[PDB]
Design a protein around this ligand. Structure first.
Ligand SMILES: CC(C)(COP(=O)(O)OP(=O)(O)OC[C@H]1O[C@@H](n2cnc3c(N)ncnc32)[C@H](O)[C@@H]1OP(=O)(O)O)[C@@H](O)C(=O)NCCC(=O)NCCS
Ligand SMILES: CC(C)(COP(=O)(O)OP(=O)(O)OC[C@H]1O[C@@H](n2cnc3c(N)ncnc32)[C@H](O)[C@@H]1OP(=O)(O)O)[C@@H](O)C(=O)NCCC(=O)NCCS
Ligand SMILES: CC(C)(COP(=O)(O)OP(=O)(O)OC[C@H]1O[C@@H](n2cnc3c(N)ncnc32)[C@H](O)[C@@H]1OP(=O)(O)O)[C@@H](O)C(=O)NCCC(=O)NCCS
Ligand SMILES: CC(C)(COP(=O)(O)OP(=O)(O)OC[C@H]1O[C@@H](n2cnc3c(N)ncnc32)[C@H](O)[C@@H]1OP(=O)(O)O)[C@@H](O)C(=O)NCCC(=O)NCCS
Ligand SMILES: CC(C)(COP(=O)(O)OP(=O)(O)OC[C@H]1O[C@@H](n2cnc3c(N)ncnc32)[C@H](O)[C@@H]1OP(=O)(O)O)[C@@H](O)C(=O)NCCC(=O)NCCS
Ligand SMILES: CC(C)(COP(=O)(O)OP(=O)(O)OC[C@H]1O[C@@H](n2cnc3c(N)ncnc32)[C@H](O)[C@@H]1OP(=O)(O)O)[C@@H](O)C(=O)NCCC(=O)NCCS
Lengths: 242, 246, 241, 239, 239, 239
C-alpha cells in the first residue's frame, strides 16, 4: 500500500474502500493500474484493518474500461499476452474467489473492461446515475479479457447480447433489472447504502462468510450429486478452520 | 408407508396429495425422523392412484424452519463420521433426489416461515406458490454454518448469482414478493388466497396428460447442462419414449 | 431465393425481411418450409444486399409451431431426417448465423416457433403477440430443441410453469421472463425492429459477428478457459477484419 | 435371509458372492433388492473394511435376468430399472468402503456396471467378457454404456458394444476394464492380497482418496484444486 | 459422376474409397463436398448396411489438400470452405445412421485423423504410417483434428504426436487406441470385411442406437446417462 | 538456489536442486521454481524446458517437514502456501509458454506427480520408482495430484495406485500413460535430448498454440471445439 499512484485505499472501521484513482483519465485501467490493483488486493487479504473490501472509482467514474492508449494501443505476442493476463490477474482471478467479501460500488461511468471486476465482486450496489456500457463494439473490438464471460455469468442471454451487440448505455436501475447489480439507489445514498451492507457482512463469521460465498460460485457447473459431495466437504472444512 | 407417521401429514383432495410437514411446535424443523418419513411418503405417493399432483407445505405458521438444530445438527455432531454421512444423505434423499425428478408434478406452497434447509425441497419441487406474508431466509450464516446439504446448489439453480450471494452472505429475510422477483417461486399472493391459488394450479396440472407432463418437466431439468446438439438428441429419444409409454 | 413457395424475402437498405409465408396455415412449419428456410438462410449469409436478417411471419402469425398435418402426423431414418431438417435452420444455422438476426414476433408464437425465436440474436415482440408452449395440451413434449431453447433464456421456474401449464402469455410477459429483448405495440413493432436493425448495421460487421458468437460460446466454459478462448477470438477478429 | 447373495467374513474381507448359479448369476429384481440390502448393511458392519464382489460357480454374472428383469406399467418398470442401478452404481461407485470385483467367469451385459462401479477389479484369464446386448436386440441400457465409456477408450467401448464379441481377462486388462488378470487358480489369493493391502490403509483416508479420484474427473483444474483442498481438510477433521 | 471418391457395393458393404492417388488422397474442397453427398446418399441406400472408409492406392489420406484447401479468400468464404470439411469428416460421420469402419491402408496424416476417428471403428495395416504432421507444416491440427485425437487417445500420446510430428505405424496406433486392430496389409481387407460382416449380422436399428449412445453419454454424469439410456432404450424398442 | 538451470543449444535443463532431501518440494522451492519458470518463458536462450531432478531423485514429493509439518498456521496462510505449490506445479506448467519435458531420472512420489503431469511430455527411466504414497502417510493426494493422475491415467490405474500406494517402475508408468516413453537410465538423458531437439525444430508459435489447444479442447463438445480451433488457428497465423 506504499507509493500507490493509480489506486487509493481508505480504511473505515473494518471497511477497505479501494478506489481506482485515475480520475483525469476516468479511471481507465492501464498496465500500471493492473499491477497496483493486484498488489493492493493481495495485501488486503492479510491486512487485519479490513474484513470487507469495497471497490469503487474516484471522481465521476467507476471505470471507463481499459486504457485505450496504455493498455490497448501501446500493446511481441508473449509480451502482449502477459499484459493481458495481468489485467485478469486482479479483475477476476483474485476478485472472483477473494479471501474477504467484496462489494462493487458503481458511482458513475462503468464501460467495457470495468464489467469484469464489477462482476467478479461478490455484491454490487450501483447509483441510479451510474451509466453502464458494453461499448467495445463501437471501438471495433469484442468484449475480450473476461468481459464476455463475466456478463454471461450474471445476465440473461437476451440482455447480454443486446448490450454487447448494440453498445447501448443504461443506468443503474436497468443494471439491477438485468441482474448486473444487487441494488440501485441515488448517488447521494450510495455510500451510506454500501457502508451499511459492508457493516452487515462484517458482523458475520468471517470464515463461514468466506466459505459460503466461495461455495456458491463453485457449485454452479456441478450436477446436484456432485454439489452435495462438495458442499459436505466444504461444510467440514469450514468447521475445521474456524 | 402412510401409517404411523409421526412428523408428516397427508390429505387427499380430488387427485391432490397435500403433504404438510407436521412439527408445528418445532416450526416444521426437519429432523432425521422427518427425513426418513418424508422419503417413505413421497415414495408411496408416486404409485398412489389417489393423487396426480403433490403439494408440499407446512402445518401451522411455518412452511419449514430449516434442519432441526437439535435432532439433525446437535445430536449428530459427535456421531461417527459414516453415521453423520448417512444422516446427511437421508435429508437429500427426499429433499432433492426424490423431489427434483418426482414421477408426479410437485408444487411447493410456502405458507409461512421458510429458512435454511427448506430452500432445497422448495426449489426441487417443479412449481412454487408463496404467501406475500411468508418470510424467507438463508440464515445459515447467522448460525455459523454454510448452506450445506444442497441448499447452495438449489439457490444457484433458480436465482441469479447476485441474488444468490446477497441472501446467502447477508442472511437477510425477504417476503414472497421478493421471492417471486428473484425467481425463487413462481407466484406470490396474499396468504388468504394461497391455498385456492395453489389448488387452481394443481387442478390445471391434473388436467394435463400425466405421462407427457412427467416427461416434459423432467426433460427441462435434464437438458440444461447439455449442448444444443446433445439436447436435440436427448429430446428426440425423450419424445419417442413419451409416445411409447403413454 | 427463386421459386420459394412458403417463405418471402424482402431487401430493405441492408435488411433482409425474411417472413414465413403460410398465413392461411398461421405460418405452420412444414418439411417444405424447413427445407426452404435453410435454403434461404444459407444464401443470405453471403448475399451482399443484407447485413442483418429479420425473421417474422406474414399475416397475424409469427408462427403457430410445427405443421400438425405435414410435420408430425405425416421409417425411423426418414422421420429422423425430417426432424433434423427442422433444427437445421431453426437453431443449427440461426444460433451462430454469420450475420446479426432479429426475431420480430408479430403475432401467434407457439411450440416449435420458440426455437428459431430463441436461436436469433435478438427479439422484438408485439405486446399483442401471443406466446405459448401448448405442446402439453396436444399430448407431446417440447421436442426438437424447444425445451433446450426455453431453458437457454428463461429461469427454471418460468420455464417449468409455461411448459407444464401450456398457459399463453403476451409480449410484455415474454419481455419480463427474458424470452425477448423488448415488447412494443404492434403499430410500432416494425419501426422499432427496423431501428434496431439499422443500429446493428452501423456496427463493424466482423466485430459484431465475432462478439455475438463469443457470448454464446463462453457460457459452458470455466473462467480460465473463457479467457483463453476470448483472447484467441479477439485475435481472430482483428485478423479477418 | 438372503436367497440370491452369499456373504462370507474373512479377517475384515466381506466376500459378496452372486448366488444364482442355476441362472449363471443373472441379476433379477430379487437379487437387485437383496444386493442393496447387503451393501447398506455392510457399510456399517465393523466386521469388514473391504468388500469383494464376485460370483458363485463358474460365473461372475451373465447380465440382467432375461426373464425376471426384462421379459416379466411405466412407473413400475422405471422403479425396477432404478432398483438395479440403486446398487449397481449409485451405492457401489461411491461406496463407503473399498470394493474389489473378482471376475471368476462369465461377465456379460449388465454385469459390467457393478464391475466398473467397484473401485478395483481382478479378473481370471479364463473369464469370458462380453457386451452381448446387441446380440439380444437391445442396447446396453441401465448404465452399462456409460460404465464402459468410463474405464475404456472410445474405440474399445464401441468395438465390443457394436460387435458383441467376447474377450478374456487379459484383453479386459489391456483395455483397462480390470486392473489385473491372473490364472483362475491364482485369482482369489491375488484378490485377497489386494484386499489385505487395502485393509492396511487408514480407512478414512482411503475412502476419501478413492472418492476424490472419481469426483474430480469432470472438474477443471482450478475447481479440482478447490475441491481437493476441502476434501483433505474434511479428511483430517473426521480421522 | 464423382471424381474424387469411389463407391463399391459388396454384400451390404459400401467400400468408400478416397480417389485422388496422384495427390495421395489429399482432401480438397471438391472431395469434401463429394464425400458429404456420398454419405448422404448411402444412409438411405439399401445396398449397404455398413460403410468402410478407406483410400485408393498406397494412401488412406495425406490430410487436407495443401494447395486446393489451404493455399487457394473472404472471411465467410474461408469459413464455409472450412465448415464443408467438418460437415462430412465429423458432423455426418460421428453420428452416422449406419456403422462405419475406417480401413487405414496407407498414409494417414493430419486432417485424415478426423474422419478416421469419427468413424465408429478402425482397422489399420501394420505398414500404414500415421502422423500428426501439421506442426511440420507450420499449422496447428485445426478443423477438429485436435479434438478427435483427444477423443480416443490419452493426453500423453496425443501431445507427443501433435508436438513432435513424429510418424508411427499401425501397431503403435493400436497401442494408443487410435484404431481397434492392426494387421499385415495382406490381411487388412479380409479382416476389415469380417468385421463389416459381423456388423451386418446385427439388428441395424439396435446397432445404430447403441453406437450413438456410447458417444452421447461420454460427458454425462452417471445420473444423467442413466436417464438418457432409459429413454434411448425405449426409443430403440419403439423404432 | 533450490533449482539448477543449464542452457544447452536451446534446451533449458531445469533441475530440482535439493538432493540431500531427495528434491523434496519446500515452500522455498515452490517460490523459487515459479520465478525460474517465469524467467525462462521470456529467456530467448531457451525454446524448450526439461524438468528433472538432481541426484538419484526426480522429486520425493512435498517437503514433509517444511511444507506439511511446519504449516500445521492460520487457515489463510496455509491456503497461501498450498496455492504457491500449484502456482508452478500446474498453474504455470500446464499451459507454459514453451514446450516442457519431464525427465524422471529417479524417485518420483506424491506431489511430484503434479508437475510431472503438467509438463507437456515425459520420459522416464525404467529403474525410476514412482509412487502415490500419500495413502501410506495418512493423507489423500491433495494439491492437484488426484486431478493430475486422472488426467493422464485411466480410472482403474489411477484408483489402483492411489488406493494401494504400490510403487511401480518406468515401464509400468509408460504402460498406464503416465509418461510417453521409458528407457534405461543410461539412455535417459540422450533420449530426452532427442525429443527436446525435435521440439526445438518446430515453429515455436505453432508449437505453443498446438500444445495448448490439445488441453483446452478436452471438455468441449465437438461443435464448440471446432469453433475454438478455427479461432486458435487464426490466432496462430496472426501471431
Ligand atoms: C467515460 C466517458 C463517458 C467520460 O466522459 P467525459 O466526462 O466527457 O470525459 P472525456 O471523454 O473528455 O475523457 C476524459 C479523459 O480521460 C480519457 N479517457 C476516458 N476514457 C478513457 C479510456 N478507456 N481509456 C483511456 N483514456 C480514457 C480521455 O482520453 C481523456 O483524456 P484527456 O483528458 O487527457 O484528453 C468518456 O470518456 C468515454 O466514453 N470513454 C470511453 C468509454 C469506453 O467506451 N470504454 C470501452 C473502450 S473499448
Ligand atoms: C422460524 C422462527 C422465526 C419462528 O419463530 P417463533 O414463532 O417465535 O417460534 P420459536 O422461535 O419460539 O420456536 C418454536 C420452537 O420451535 C423450535 N424451532 C424453531 N426452529 C427450529 C429449528 N430449525 N430447529 C429446531 N427447532 C426449532 C424452537 O427451538 C422452539 O422449540 P421449543 O418450543 O421447544 O423451545 C424461529 O424459530 C427462528 O428464528 N429460527 C429457526 C430458523 C432458521 O434460521 N433455520 C436455519 C438455522 S441453520
Ligand atoms: C394459432 C391459432 C391461435 C390461430 O387461431 P385462428 O386465427 O383462429 O386460426 P385457426 O385456428 O382457425 O386455424 C387457421 C388454419 O391454420 C391451421 N393451423 C393453425 N395452426 C396450425 C398448426 N400448428 N399446424 C398446422 N395447421 C395450423 C389450421 O388447421 C387452420 O387450417 P384450415 O383453415 O385450412 O382448416 C390457432 O391455430 C390455435 O389455437 N393453435 C395453433 C396450434 C398450436 O398451438 N401449435 C403448437 C402445437 S404442438
Ligand atoms: C453365460 C453363458 C455363456 C453360460 O453358458 P452355459 O454354461 O452353456 O449355460 P446355459 O446357457 O446352457 O443355461 C444357464 C441357465 O441359466 C440361464 N441363463 C444364462 N444367462 C442368463 C441370463 N442373462 N438371464 C437369465 N437366465 C440366464 C439360462 O436360461 C439357463 O436357464 P435353464 O438352465 O433353466 O434353461 C450363457 O448362458 C449365456 O450366453 N447367457 C447370456 C449372456 C448374455 O448375453 N447377457 C446379456 C443379456 S442382454
Ligand atoms: C504422403 C507422403 C508421405 C507420400 O510421399 P511420396 O509417396 O514419396 O510422394 P510425394 O511426396 O511426391 O506426393 C505425391 C503428390 O501428392 C501431393 N501431395 C502429397 N500430400 C499432399 C497434400 N496434403 N496436399 C496436397 N498434395 C499432396 C504432392 O504435392 C505431390 O504432388 P505432385 O506429384 O504433383 O508433385 C508425402 O506426400 C507427404 O508427406 N505428404 C504430406 C503429409 C502431411 O503432412 N499432411 C498434413 C499437411 S498440414
Ligand atoms: C525417496 C526415498 C525412497 C529415498 O530413500 P533414501 O535414498 O534411502 O533417502 P532417505 O529416506 O534416507 O532420506 C534422505 C533425506 O531426504 C529427506 N527426504 C526424503 N524424502 C523427503 C520428503 N518428502 N520430504 C522431506 N524430506 C525428505 C529425508 O528426511 C532425509 O533427510 P535427512 O538425511 O536430513 O534425515 C525416501 O525418502 C522415501 O521413501 N520417501 C520420501 C517421501 C515420500 O516418499 N512420499 C511423500 C510423502 S506424502
Amino acid at each position: 500500500l506504499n507509493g500507490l499512484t493509480t489506486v487509493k485505499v481508505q480504511f473505515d472501521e473494518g471497511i477497505a474502500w479501494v478506489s481506482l484513482n485515475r480520475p483525469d483519465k476516468r479511471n481507465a485501467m492501464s498496465p500500471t493500474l493492473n499491477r497496483e490493483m493486484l498488489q493492493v488486493l493481495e495485501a488486503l487479504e492479510f491486512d487485519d484493518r479490513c474484513g470487507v473490501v469495497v471497490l469503487t472509482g474516484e471522481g465521476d467514474s467507476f471505470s471507463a474500461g481499459m486504457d485505450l492508449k496504455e493498455y490497448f494501443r501501446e500493446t511481441p505476442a508473449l509480451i502482449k499476452a502477459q499484459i493481458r493476463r495481468a489485467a485478469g490477474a486482479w479483475q477476476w482471478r483474485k476478485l472472483r474467489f477473494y479471501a474477504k467479501p467484496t462489494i462493487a460500488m458503481v458511482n458513475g461511468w462503468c464501460f467495457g473492461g470495468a464489467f469484469t471486476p464489477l462482476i467478479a465482486c461478490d455484491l454490487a450496489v450501483a447509483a441510479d446515475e451510474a451509466t453502464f456500457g458494453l461499448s467495445e463494439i463501437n471501438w471495433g473490438i469484442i468484449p475480450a479479457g473476461n468481459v464476455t464471460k463475466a456478463v454471461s455469468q450474471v445476465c440473461g442471454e437476451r440482455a447480454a447480447l443486446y448490450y454487447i451487440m448494440s453498445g447501448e448505455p443504461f443506468g443503474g436501475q436497468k443494471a439491477r433489472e438485468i441482474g448486473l447489480v444487487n441494488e440501485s439507489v441515488p448517488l447521494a445514498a450510495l455510500r451510506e447504502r454500501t457502508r451499511e451492507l459492508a457493516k452487515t457482512l462484517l458482523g458475520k463469521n468471517p470464515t463461514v462468510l468466506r466459505q459460503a460465498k466461495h461455495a456458491l460460485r463453485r457449485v454452479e457447473p456441478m450436477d446436484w450429486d456432485l454439489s452435495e459431495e462438495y458442499l459436505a466437504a466444504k461444510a467440514e472444512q469450514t468447521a475445521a478452520i474456524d
